[PDB]
Amino acid sequence: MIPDDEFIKNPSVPGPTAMEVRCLIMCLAEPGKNDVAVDVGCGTGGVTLELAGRVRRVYAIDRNPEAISTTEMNLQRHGLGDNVTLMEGDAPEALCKIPDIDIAVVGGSGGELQEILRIIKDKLKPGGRIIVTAILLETKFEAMECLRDLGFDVNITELNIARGRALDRGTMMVSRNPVALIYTGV
Amino acid sequence: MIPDDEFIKNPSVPGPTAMEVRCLIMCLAEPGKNDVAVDVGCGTGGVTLELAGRVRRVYAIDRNPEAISTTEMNLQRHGLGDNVTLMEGDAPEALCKIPDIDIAVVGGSGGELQEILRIIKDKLKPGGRIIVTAILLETKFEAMECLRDLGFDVNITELNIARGRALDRGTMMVSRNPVALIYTGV
Amino acid sequence: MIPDDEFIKNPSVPGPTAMEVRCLIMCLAEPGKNDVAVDVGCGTGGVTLELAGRVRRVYAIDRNPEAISTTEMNLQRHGLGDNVTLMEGDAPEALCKIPDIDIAVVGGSGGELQEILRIIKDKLKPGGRIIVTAILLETKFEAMECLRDLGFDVNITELNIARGRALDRGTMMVSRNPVALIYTGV
Amino acid sequence: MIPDDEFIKNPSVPGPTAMEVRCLIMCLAEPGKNDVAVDVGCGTGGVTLELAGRVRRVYAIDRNPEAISTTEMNLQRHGLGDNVTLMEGDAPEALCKIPDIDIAVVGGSGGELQEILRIIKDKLKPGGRIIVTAILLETKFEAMECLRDLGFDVNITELNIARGRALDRGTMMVSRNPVALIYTGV
């Protein structure tokens, strides 16, 4: 899978998300060449780039113009983006113009996490998956509470990753920052 | 991906490998529908199940008869096990009778870690990957060194995981023991 | 510092608090021989013990009768307790009957966290510290919010500890569950 | 305890040791006002500083000339050093001119870990304590082996610490690199 260092970043644009995390988001998302997925807060584009090649169509949304721009750049360098619709705009309004979805990945909550999830539940085909990524503490709580309030079966997994860096003196373990995945069962 | 709680267990068989680990093992290995893989120490059968439904033929090895049994039981539970050759017995003697592999996943060291890897290097098809899962401090070290000594490009990723357990009082974070993954380039 | 395995553990009562966490608690508490401290949810009695041999007076509270007994037993085995006042009853009602404190440690709340902090803030001597342990996801968010909402500068440290366990096969890394410490500036 | 940001950091000297780790080290070292201690690879002087205030004497050693300089700098800026014999040079040679030690803390091995531990065992007074800080994957293993081969009861604790950082968005957990502590039975 495309390792972190292989992605073009940006100052005002966070990401890419740790490969280990991206790897797990895909395992939970349970892709498919016939699935329609939406990725909110596509940021650097990691999550979008991955899905761009395992489903029918992916809607990448992000209020920050730089993010939509940053994702596009990576999509182009990897020659992907055919089944990807970029959307410059607020998440709630961006979602309303989209068909029902099979997969839903919500990155940077954007302080609109609750409203964002509410909408997603109204457009979730049967057996749909909803995966919420969280970097902020307050975000994990809100993600559990809302998804629960919408009648979903919420689960949460915290991932503390450490990779080894080759030094002259030997190998050192470099830590990533904690990343929790709040998701709904099938 | 089959969640941990959906596996048939055995009071004498460890495992199955944490899902988050199973997931990352698959991202790294990058299974092809034409690859020949071997899983030393299949234990409960996690990794074996995951490879089974993605490659041509998987050779699942294990010293414990209960293991071969449990793995075979979880195989049938998901309509898989046609392209899986089970092997009871010591790894070294089992590995020598095997054809060349594209993917090598070695589970619990077994005290013969260094010998196992050695046998695998001479049986690895060009472009093959070797992945070692370690829970023991010493196994992590011996893997790194030995793989380097055999002329491979080694890397190590440690995963401390925490899952949420619903309690009356709320959600608790329960962690799994650290799992390191020592892998080679391609 | 009294190591874990040296405490009388009652299966029904939680604890003792991982020695590593207890160490960090004392470091953040900055106990003085003239300080007055209260420990809500003393449980096994780990924290109470540490403070007992370091402050003027320690008020140990816990709504569980077995926790009080367990805490009393352990204190005796360590000749401590001569300057400790155990309390049988609910926290909130037990807090109003206590003098003002310099050090407040709060363990297992019980859905009464908000109220418990509200009382501790009112009885907190100037300069005093407030330290809250949280194993529940929710308690972490709640302690962070309530302490902030009560006008305190809040800080949070997550501890993921792994100790080594010698096995015939080698050294296994055994992980304790995550433990957070939410505290107010000194 | 002296926090991280309160230390004079030199661009050529590593450290200071994370306050959470220093706290644990002081806990395992069980400092006594009579104990004679030695800090190998004092770095910024965090460990030396702490000890200087709780034991008879302290011999801070470090191959790096700038480290010695930076360590002597943090001593004065806190009113300590009247009992801190600084030493610039190779640890092994430096230790020979030192008295028998009660407490021994070793960090930077510079690749002479084994030679250092051996020397320490010959100078270790009964009831003495040895504590090694490992950052390199290889160091942990080596330390375990030597200490076992020297007739000591080895113990290892892996610490993964995360501190919360205040963002306009709210609160994120920032990870520190893993830090392992290999210690002998007192």
UniProtKB/Swiss-Prot annotation, chains A, B, C, D:
What processes in GO biological process is this protein linked to? Answer: anaerobic cobalamin biosynthetic process; methylation
Q: Which reaction does it catalyse?
A: Co-precorrin-6B + S-adenosyl-L-methionine = Co-precorrin-7 + S-adenosyl-L-homocysteine + CO2
Binding of S-adenosyl-L-methionine, residues:
17, 41-45, 62, 91
One Pfam family cited in the UniProt record for this chain: Methyltransf_31
User: What is its pathway?
Assistant: Cofactor biosynthesis; adenosylcobalamin biosynthesis; cob(II)yrinate a,c-diamide from sirohydrochlorin (anaerobic route): step 8/10
Any one Gene Ontology molecular-function term assigned to this protein's record: protein methyltransferase activity
Q: Which HAMAP family match?
A: CbiT
Q: How does it assemble?
A: Homotetramer.
Annotated protein name in UniProt: Probable cobalt-precorrin-6B C(15)-methyltransferase (decarboxylating)
Species assigned in the record? Methanothermobacter thermautotrophicus (strain ATCC 29096 / DSM 1053 / JCM 10044 / NBRC 100330 / Delta H)
Gene field: cbiT
